[PDB]
Scaffold this motif. Structure first.
Motif, short mmCIF file in Angstrom:
data_model
loop_
_atom_site.label_atom_id
_atom_site.label_comp_id
_atom_site.label_asym_id
_atom_site.label_seq_id
_atom_site.Cartn_x
_atom_site.Cartn_y
_atom_site.Cartn_z
N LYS A 1 1.24 -1.20 -0.15
CA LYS A 1 -0.21 0.08 0.12
C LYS A 1 0.74 1.32 -0.05
O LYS A 1 0.41 2.25 -0.44
CB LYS A 1 -0.74 0.23 1.40
N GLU A 2 1.86 0.53 0.33
CA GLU A 2 3.12 1.89 0.20
C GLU A 2 4.00 2.04 -0.65
O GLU A 2 4.45 1.01 -0.80
CB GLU A 2 3.24 2.91 1.51
N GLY A 3 5.48 3.07 -0.34
CA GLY A 3 6.75 2.72 -2.21
C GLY A 3 7.33 1.64 -1.15
O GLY A 3 7.90 1.74 0.09
N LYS A 4 7.10 0.26 -1.85
CA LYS A 4 7.84 -0.89 -1.34
C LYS A 4 9.67 -0.50 -1.32
O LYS A 4 10.37 0.25 -1.22
CB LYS A 4 8.35 -1.75 -3.07
N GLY A 5 9.97 -1.76 -0.66
CA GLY A 5 11.57 -1.71 -0.30
C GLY A 5 12.03 -3.07 0.59
O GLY A 5 11.46 -3.48 2.01
N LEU A 6 12.74 -3.99 -0.21
CA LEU A 6 12.85 -5.32 0.61
C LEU A 6 13.85 -4.67 1.58
O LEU A 6 13.52 -5.54 2.66
CB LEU A 6 14.29 -6.03 -0.49
N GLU B 1 15.26 -1.29 2.30
CA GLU B 1 14.75 0.08 1.80
C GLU B 1 13.53 0.47 2.83
O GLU B 1 13.58 2.30 3.10
CB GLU B 1 15.21 0.21 0.85
N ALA B 2 13.21 0.19 3.20
CA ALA B 2 11.62 0.20 3.30
C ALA B 2 11.42 -0.22 4.70
O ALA B 2 10.51 0.60 5.72
CB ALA B 2 9.78 -0.33 2.31
N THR B 3 11.69 -1.57 5.17
CA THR B 3 11.42 -1.75 6.81
C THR B 3 12.71 -1.08 7.89
O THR B 3 12.76 -1.60 8.66
CB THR B 3 12.49 -3.23 6.21
N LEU B 4 13.68 -0.59 7.33
CA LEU B 4 14.49 -0.16 7.47
C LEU B 4 14.04 1.70 7.93
O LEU B 4 14.06 2.52 8.73
CB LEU B 4 16.09 0.24 6.97
N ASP B 5 13.30 2.02 7.12
CA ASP B 5 12.91 3.39 6.94
C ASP B 5 11.22 3.24 7.93
O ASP B 5 11.51 4.30 8.84
CB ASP B 5 12.43 3.84 5.79
N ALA B 6 11.19 2.10 8.23
CA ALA B 6 9.83 2.36 8.94
C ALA B 6 9.76 1.79 10.71
O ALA B 6 9.86 2.64 11.26
CB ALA B 6 8.76 0.65 8.61
N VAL B 7 11.92 0.52 10.81
CA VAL B 7 12.21 0.79 12.38
C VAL B 7 13.12 1.75 12.01
O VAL B 7 14.11 1.87 13.18
CB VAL B 7 13.37 -0.65 12.10
N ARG B 8 12.12 3.29 11.85
CA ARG B 8 13.95 4.74 12.37
C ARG B 8 12.46 6.01 12.57
O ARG B 8 12.76 6.12 12.84
CB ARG B 8 13.72 4.77 11.43
N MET B 9 10.95 5.60 12.77
CA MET B 9 10.33 5.87 12.93
C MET B 9 8.97 6.24 14.11
O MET B 9 7.59 6.20 13.94
CB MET B 9 9.07 6.79 11.84
N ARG B 10 9.24 4.91 15.51
CA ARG B 10 8.72 4.16 16.34
C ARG B 10 9.57 3.43 16.98
O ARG B 10 8.58 2.44 17.77
CB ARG B 10 7.38 3.59 15.47
#
Lengths: 50, 50, 40
Positions: free
Chosen positions: B2-7, B9-18
């Motif tokens: 549903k949001e901009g993908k990342g194998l 590259e998106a999982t590290l962006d998530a683990v940086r905002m909560r």
């Protein structure tokens, strides 16, 4: 334990929408309970598992 | 999805905002369970095993 | 002021970047966790 915990995310992900994205409250955390929508109806149903 | 993908590259962006929660709440515990681990061994010998 | 300064670096350079350096080399964690499962 759990009753203390689940109350933080719906207060901390509230910090994001105003400490990061800047803009005023109310509709701030409106779309942040949607990042934890399944982490509400499908935390409990898998917590209830054990 | 549903949001901009990342194998990686998106999982590290998530683990940086909560990461606050999964470190402060997994900590609001422990010491919230510390009054039972010891602190008391007389009347509550069952608080030890729990 | 700033004491949240202390761990905002520990979240990035010692966590975020170091975390990205373990799936960088997934490898031996295939056994390291199978020695925890069959270790417990």
């Amino acid at each position: 334990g759990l009753l203390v915990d689940a109350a933080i995310v719906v207060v901390e992900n509230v910090e994001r929408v105003m400490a990061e994205e800047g803009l005023p409250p109310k509709e701030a955390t409106r779309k942040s309970m949607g990042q934890i929508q399944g982490a509400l109806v499908g935390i409990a149903m898998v917590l209830s598992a054990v | 999805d549903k949001e901009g993908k990342g194998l990686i590259e998106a999982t590290l962006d998530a683990v940086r905002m909560r990461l606050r929660p999964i470190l402060m709440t997994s900590l609001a515990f422990i010491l919230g369970v510390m009054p039972l681990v010891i602190s008391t061994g007389a009347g509550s010998g069952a608080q030890n095993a729990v | 002021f700033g004491w949240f300064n202390r761990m905002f670096e520990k979240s990035t350079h010692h966590y975020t970047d170091s975390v990205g350096g373990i799936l960088r080399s997934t490898g031996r964690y295939l056994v390291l966790y199978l020695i925890i499962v069959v270790g417990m």
